[PDB]
Amino acid sequence: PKSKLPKPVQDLIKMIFDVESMKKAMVEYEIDLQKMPLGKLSKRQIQAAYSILSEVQQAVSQGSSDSQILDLSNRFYTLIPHDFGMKKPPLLNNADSVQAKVEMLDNLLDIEVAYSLLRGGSDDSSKDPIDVNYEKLKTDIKVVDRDSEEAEIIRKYVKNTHATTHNAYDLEVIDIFKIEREGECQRYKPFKQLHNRRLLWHGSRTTNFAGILSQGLRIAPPEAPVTGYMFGKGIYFADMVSKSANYCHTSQGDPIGLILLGEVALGNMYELKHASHISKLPKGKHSVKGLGKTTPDPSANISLDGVDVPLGTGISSGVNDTSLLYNEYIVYDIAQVNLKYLLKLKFNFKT
Ligand SMILES: O=C(O)[C@@H]1C[C@H](O)CN1C(=O)c1cc(Cc2n[nH]c(=O)c3ccccc23)ccc1F
């Protein structure tokens, strides 16, 4: 059975549902596949790990000793078995180590969604599994003509917003997809006319895109420690392609990555220079903007389908004493995002 989908779409489907890629991500995080196989992942186990990780975070920040931290750290390694043989696991005694485990759980959530999609549903050998797996995304995916104005605008956005501090690689756009998740347009209606709507980047491991397409971008679950995210539990975006592209976690051994373009209803922005692990926005605020030292040239903004595209070259923002080299944007209501495009990127590493 041969699928009728365009070849770029078929290859995309194979990328996101690649089971061996899910295993490789788990191994990359040091998880013990024998004790925690991909098929044994569950959301409740992940949430329990989140909760334990919160206790470690509270102990770490409140200034505890390694003896007091030891029991809390060991508890986390019980819920998520790691591959350390018969040696004691590394102690989670500092905020950086705890942060790494927060990031691991974030990725396990999307992997569990992807595998759950593959192992659910029906099996029909008369259909092409590419077609079967495509239908599980509840997302309409179309290839954008390379000569369309959409493509030129998107390519210029990629070409102009690569940061100098991310010059270990440059980006080649292979395929541009126009994506429409079922029900997302309806969910976006209260914000579709809001001011300060921008087209922003969101990169992520390829293993997270089956979950992102079928369920959309989500906020971290209630069990996740809010102190594990620089601006709290929201959905994070960038206006520099390279800043988002770094979160694809590509390498010489895997140079193909995926990145999202989404219309984000920012509205009135809460502008911050340093970490603020907030639960809600102040009254009247719709989003947070981490103020970067560098910003795309404001005068170079253009309009695509009524949405501002900040594709200008990077220049100084005039903001002093900030923790961020480049901007980032956070919304705390999943309804404020309307995904528009998905790009397949080739990373040419210059190292
Ligand atoms: O993606 C997740 O793991 C988490 C959990 C849940 O999916 C929601 N989520 C985030 O949106 C999230 C992402 C980052 C990384 C990041 N920071 N800044 C950027 O500009 C940026 C641009 C593109 C891709 C990533 C980034 C940090 C904290 C977060 F909450």
Side-chain angles (χ1 to χ4, degrees):
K2 275 191 172 62
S3 167
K4 197 62 227 183
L5 292 167
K7 211 261 193 302
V9 177
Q10 301 194 32
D11 292 347
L12 176 64
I13 298 299
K14 295 183 285 188
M15 310 187 39
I16 72 166
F17 284 108
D18 191 326
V19 167
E20 301 309 310
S21 302
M22 312 180 188
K23 292 152 133 205
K24 178 165 175 291
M26 278 160 78
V27 171
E28 183 173 342
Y29 289 115
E30 307 228 60
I31 294 173
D32 188 329
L33 288 294
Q34 272 192 352
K35 277 281 294 174
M36 176 75 89
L38 180 60
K40 268 56 188 300
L41 271 180
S42 79
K43 195 198 166 70
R44 75 176 53 80
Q45 299 176 75
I46 291 171
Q47 304 177 66
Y50 270 123
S51 299
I52 298 299
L53 209 51
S54 299
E55 270 216 75
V56 183
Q57 188 90 86
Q58 286 294 300
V60 161
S61 67
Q62 285 214 292
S64 297
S65 58
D66 286 4
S67 92
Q68 296 167 337
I69 271 294
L70 177 56
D71 300 295
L72 303 179
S73 180
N74 284 328
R75 289 173 182 171
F76 173 83
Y77 291 113
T78 308
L79 295 176
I80 307 298
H82 285 53
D83 183 65
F84 299 124
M86 283 302 108
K87 245 285 183 63
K88 294 178 182 177
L91 185 66
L92 303 169
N93 55 4
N94 57 94
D96 258 5
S97 291
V98 176
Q99 186 56 43
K101 297 313 179 179
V102 173
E103 316 176 336
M104 165 202 278
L105 294 182
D106 297 336
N107 289 281
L108 293 187
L109 292 162
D110 302 332
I111 293 178
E112 190 279 337
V113 175
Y115 200 81
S116 177
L117 282 177
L118 281 182
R119 292 320 155 210
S122 309
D123 176 52
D124 178 5
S125 61
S126 67
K127 296 183 181 178
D128 189 322
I130 305 304
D131 289 329
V132 175
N133 287 338
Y134 172 81
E135 157 264 335
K136 301 184 186 303
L137 299 180
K138 282 91 63 187
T139 299
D140 178 72
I141 310 178
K142 290 160 168 282
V143 184
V144 181
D145 192 318
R146 312 172 188 270
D147 295 308
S148 66
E149 210 166 49
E150 286 172 308
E152 305 196 89
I153 291 176
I154 295 178
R155 279 194 305 263
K156 183 174 188 179
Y157 200 179
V158 175
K159 181 174 121 128
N160 281 8
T161 72
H162 198 124
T164 295
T165 65
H166 305 155
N167 75 343
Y169 66 93
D170 57 67
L171 287 176
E172 171 190 345
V173 179
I174 304 307
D175 298 311
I176 301 176
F177 302 101
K178 190 165 189 176
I179 61 177
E180 185 176 342
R181 292 191 54 256
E182 289 185 30
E184 195 170 72
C185 186
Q186 170 98 302
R187 182 180 74 178
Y188 189 69
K189 268 172 177 133
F191 306 97
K192 71 182 186 304
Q193 69 294 286
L194 194 71
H195 66 290
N196 197 16
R197 296 171 290 112
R198 293 181 192 185
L199 202 65
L200 304 166
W201 301 105
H202 183 89
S204 184
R205 293 174 178 268
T206 299
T207 43
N208 300 329
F209 276 85
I212 299 174
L213 293 186
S214 57
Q215 295 182 345
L217 291 174
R218 302 140 303 264
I219 294 166
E223 291 83 4
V226 59
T227 58
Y229 312 84
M230 190 182 296
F231 297 110
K233 296 195 285 186
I235 308 175
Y236 286 60
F237 296 89
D239 61 9
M240 299 286 284
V241 71
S242 57
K243 179 169 183 175
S244 290
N246 290 342
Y247 288 99
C248 303
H249 291 286
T250 54
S251 55
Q252 295 78 350
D254 191 351
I256 305 297
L258 299 178
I259 191 171
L260 285 175
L261 278 179
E263 175 184 349
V264 187
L266 300 172
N268 178 223
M269 301 182 291
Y270 187 28
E271 297 187 336
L272 297 179
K273 302 183 184 183
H274 304 276
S276 172
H277 317 289
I278 60 179
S279 305
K280 313 188 334 185
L281 289 168
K283 230 190 87 66
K285 296 298 186 173
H286 300 100
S287 61
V288 159
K289 177 179 176 179
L291 301 180
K293 271 170 52 182
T294 294
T295 183
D297 193 325
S299 63
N301 264 78
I302 62 88
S303 165
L304 176 62
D305 295 350
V307 183
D308 284 325
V309 188
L311 53 66
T313 190
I315 68 176
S316 185
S317 67
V319 178
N320 308 288
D321 295 323
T322 176
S323 304
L324 292 175
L325 288 182
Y326 312 97
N327 296 326
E328 61 191 56
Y329 306 81
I330 310 84
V331 291
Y332 305 78
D333 187 340
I334 71 177
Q336 295 179 242
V337 179
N338 189 18
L339 299 183
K340 289 298 178 181
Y341 302 98
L342 188 287
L343 285 66
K344 185 179 175 182
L345 296 165
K346 174 88 160 62
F347 290 69
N348 170 42
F349 290 87
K350 291 182 287 205
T351 77

